[PDB]
């Protein structure tokens, strides 16, 4: 009887175990370490006896994925778009769309110009889907004393400091508000280094996650559109920044938001609808009020980052596509 | 002569030992500890000579189970439905309703989807009930040390925050309240997080243990109902709300619920006649005030599971069945 | 020269001296201490040469019992009923009523339902009824600290964490007060438990007690009467604790009842008039003033248990069988 929940565990049919699984979900943990920056524990291979092809992924055992590959089923696509097509299923959770192809299909989407997975992978590439949307959970306290323990070798300076300047729950409670954002902390140098220089001004951890996020914003630019080009922004029109501006209250421990349940929903429906345009799309808005938007739209829309303004360089340019706007409602809609 | 009772003694009659009534009980143990998390304290089996066929479980020596298993009684159902029928009668203390079934009966009864205890196990599947009625006494002070202590294995960062953080008799009374409400604590590394988060910026333990129970909600909310098939809710209409909201009235040691005797009562009996119309319901509320109503009509209806609207995500859907609605009562009724 | 008196001594001519008298007062050490939860002191066995058959029990060497056994004394009986009467004789300090019978008649009551001692264990059952009217005088402070010091094997935390609490005196108060009314203290566990719980938020060591009774109140209900029979209850009508209410008075070491003596006389002569109906009934008030009314009258009627309304669970229902009721009477009679 030993407390304590097994923190990842894959549950399979034999059917589906390998060989070469296990070297595989190793190779998986590797590039997601070196991708996002946070350590994940080692997974627990079940075998689960079943006639019925399914696979099943358990975070500290509550079940959270769980699907059923189809008989025909040996190649695998992740997502969908218009040049191939069949066969296609919507992921659980709002995770996605996803593919099975057969040879020939599969070989005509790889050379398309996409990877296409076949054999062990079509677990690892499904694996580390569930894992890219659970992620902020594999960072705790804990795992923020093991970060910190692995960076005394060479940086004890930067670490004995950091610890002198924020009580480890601050720094956990950073690190964990930057990686439920998909921006990555391999680069945890530069953000100690942004927590020292930022630490003593300042008291509400939100702000310092700001300013950790500022100081990384040349990766963050890169790792959204790793080419040069243009994507498009999404801006939000000064209405909907100068109606959440007073919804800033303090308290003795930091600044939150507070709007009626309507302003909230209107401004969801209203961005869920125009992201419908195109596939991909950055939200854009203030510096002073970016957190507090994504924390009115982090239940719902996930996936979609919100940029600011100062987190955009002037080296990098606009391409305006749309204008969001909204003014209040309680008071009168004036736009709604 | 040992102070401190005897944790949990199971008195037989030797007719109903047997040879794998140990390993039975063990494995019942086992079964326990996975699902709420709480680490039982090991069976003491005595053999109570009596021509009665009776059997008595005692929580630190006060005889809180007694039932006498009829002559004829070989195969055990528990709890009653529509497709079998016969030989049922009702466990004391309101614990619910069991049958006892002959083989053929009792293999209709296991094909028709159910299962069916003989043997040893119909002692295990009846001890294992009255567990479920009394597990919160079994987490306190000294068990939730061992649980910090066995925990101090891989988190020891973890554990020493949160002792720095909270002394462990609200550890404890955190952990006692959560148990009584049937929601699991196998997850103690998320629920130290929770209370390492939260602590600083509170200081009455009960709302410390409504927001691990908030992050919790989809564990919650998995093992109310395995499947994701819709499962009726039982809405509180907004003027009981609006009622208790009055009731909160703030000690240096956190905000408790006064109303008159009248207003509870009426609402007792008021929930109870509106819950005959189908087996199974879950009541519904405000997030400000569950922990309240929860603490007005726990010691009559335990079992119903009162949970809240922020407790449900967005990701599930309403199914409204009912809508409970009462104004006062000494100022007037205006409802009843 | 020792100082420090001789506990518990028994004095016994030479006639009523036994070789099975050790084991049987072994025995029935062991029995109360399963009980009542109070470790007895070994007894110390004085042969007084006496010709005339007599027995004296010695607490701490001041003569509480003296009894002479009569010479057809042989079988003993301990309290009187209809079905069987015939030398019966009051014990002093209005311990109760003895019976000695004849081999023939103590085997009828035998048969009848009761049980009979015969031999040794005549001092016995004795011997028991006198520890059973002054068990409140063994256990003190330095009984306290040995049952902590048992209870430091299994519960280490849970007894540091209760001794950072409170101090010992006031553990020893606790369950002196307890032990003064026929709780029993063998659930140490909980009692700690609930002191630990409600310590932070009292500082009246009586209120203290009454919430360790409340939290035994299942133990209390079992032990008043063992089978789910409902036995009698004496309410008593709101005009006496509406009286009482304000006799309390707050000073810096707890709250006090302040009564002329009239209003307690007349409330014990009233009760012990009303309590002559039947042998045995249980008077309830109260939750505010039960504590305050055993004050009033624990003096004069000790065999009398005062239960109150809280103590009593809506499981159990009520048989009224009286209503006592009073008013003032340094103002007006009013109901006297």
């Not at 398309?112 to 062990?120: E, H, I, N, R």
Request: glycine share 6%; net charge negative.
């Amino acid at each position: 009887m030993v407390p304590g929940a097994c923190p990842l565990i894959l549950r399979l049919s034999p059917t589906l175990h390998s060989a070469d699984l296990i070297r595989d979900i190793d190779a998986m943990r590797w590039f997601l370490f070196e991708d996002t920056g946070v350590p994940l524990p080692e997974v627990n291979i079940e075998v689960l006896p079943e006639p019925t092809e399914k696979l099943t992924v358990l975070l500290y055992q509550e079940p959270v994925f769980s699907l059923s590959i189809p008989a025909q089923a040996d190649y695998l696509l992740i997502g969908a778009d218009a040049s191939v097509v069949g066969d296609s299923q919507t992921l659980p959770n709002g995770m996605g769309q996803i593919c099975w192809l057969t040879k020939d299909m599969a070989h005509k989407a790889q050379g398309f110009g996409l990877d296409v997975f076949a054999g062990s992978q079509r677990i690892s590439a499904l694996l580390k889907c569930v894992l890219l949307r659970h992620m902020g959970e594999f960072i705790g306290v804990q795992e923020t004393r093991y970060l910190m323990n692995a960076m005394e070798k060479n940086y004890s300076e930067l670490v004995k400091e950091l610890q002198r300047q924020l009580p480890i729950n601050k720094i956990a409670e950073t690190l964990q508000r930057l990686v439920s954002e998909r921006v990555s902390i391999r680069d945890l140098r530069l953000i100690f280094g942004t927590l020292i220089d930022w630490a003593p001004r300042e008291k509400d951890v939100l702000m310092l996650t700001e300013y950790v996020r500022i100081a990384l914003r040349r990766h963050i630019l890169r790792r959204l559109n790793p080419e040069g080009k243009p994507l498009p922004i999404l801006r939000i029109g000064e209405g909907i920044e100068n109606l959440v501006r007073e919804s800033i209250r303090q308290t003795a421990m930091g600044t939150y938001t507070a709007l009626s349940s309507r302003h909230k929903t209107q401004i969801l429906q209203l961005i869920e609808q125009a992201l419908k345009q195109s596939a991909k799309l950055f939200i854009v808005t203030s510096v002073d009020t970016r957190r507090f938007l994504r924390k009115i739209t982090e239940a719902t829309l996930f996936d979609v980052p919100i940029l600011s303004w100062q987190e955009l360089g002037e080296e990098s340019l606009i391409q305006v596509v749309e204008s969001i706007d909204l003014s209040e409602e309680e008071l009168a809609d004036n736009e709604e």
